[PDB]
């Protein structure tokens, strides 16, 4: 059996607090869907 990863597999890339900002990172994440 298989399923569709429904918006999963994203983790906090580091330990820095950020707010009200969009931050771009490249690392090993599970792709959406």
Ligand X SMILES: *[C@@H]1O[C@H](CO)[C@@H](O)[C@H](O)[C@H]1NC(C)=O
Which residues here bind other proteins, judged by CB under 8 A? 14-17, 19
Start-to-end Cα distance in the chain? 16
CB 8 within 8 A of CB 30: yes
Q: What is the smallest separation between the CB atom of 32 and ligand X, expressed in angstroms? A: 14
Nearer to other proteins, 9 or 13 (CB): 13
Q: What is the smallest separation between the CB atom of 21 and other proteins, expressed in angstroms? A: 13
Q: What is the dihedral of CA 18, 24, 26, 29, to 10 degrees?
A: 70
Residues within the interface to ligand X (CB under 6 A): 2-3
């Amino acid at each position: 059996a298989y399923t569709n990863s429904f918006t999963r597999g994203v983790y906090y890339p580091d330990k820095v607090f950020r707010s009200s900002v969009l931050h771009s990172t490249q690392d090993l994440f599970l792709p959406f869907f």
